[PDB]
Design a binder for these strands. Structure first.
Lengths: 62, 73
DNA sequence: ATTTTATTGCATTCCAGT
DNA sequence: ACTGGAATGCAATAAAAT
């Protein structure tokens, strides 16, 4: 266990831009993105889940 | 213990072994209006042996979760 | 201590086979 | 029209990087 790999500036600049553009993914998007990002489709699937979760967390304390 | 109590688990491990040894068969479940399926027949046997109910999606999920576990050996 | 990847246990939704 | 099964979602959670 494990080890966690931190995705680079390009990797995330790619992701953030596509998340911004749309909140959840579609297969068509996983594929395209995966190619440009050089990451697994799986990973993309997770990064979106987590990125969402980060958004949800910020709608909490008053 | 969790959702699939060990007492239920074993009913599932019978249901498996005494419906198929390894999956098998080509849809010989309907001759009249009785349209059955593997999962549903599992859920049924869980009712007949435990009394506890558990629906076809539970049997769906459980098998998938097990497969995953198996594969990540 | 918080943030960023990754996994696990269920359910729920999407895709076909008959 | 029925189904089982894959993909996907989500909450909880873990642990490296920050």
């Amino acid at each position: 266990r494990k080890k966690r790999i931190p995705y680079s500036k390009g990797q995330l600049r790619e992701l953030e831009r596509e998340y911004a553009a749309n909140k959840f993914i579609t297969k068509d998007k996983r594929r395209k993105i995966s190619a440009a990002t050089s990451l697994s489709e799986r990973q993309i699937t997770i990064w979106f889940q987590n990125r969402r979760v980060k958004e949800k967390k910020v709608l909490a304390k008053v | 213990e969790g959702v699939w109590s060990p007492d239920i688990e074993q009913s599932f491990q019978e249901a498996l072994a005494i419906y198929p040894p390894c999956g098998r068969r080509k849809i010989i479940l309907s001759d009249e209006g009785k349209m059955y399926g593997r999962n549903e027949l599992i859920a049924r046997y869980i009712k007949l042996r435990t009394g506890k109910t558990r629906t076809r999606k539970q049997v769906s999920s459980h098998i998938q979760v097990l497969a995953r576990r198996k594969a990540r050996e």
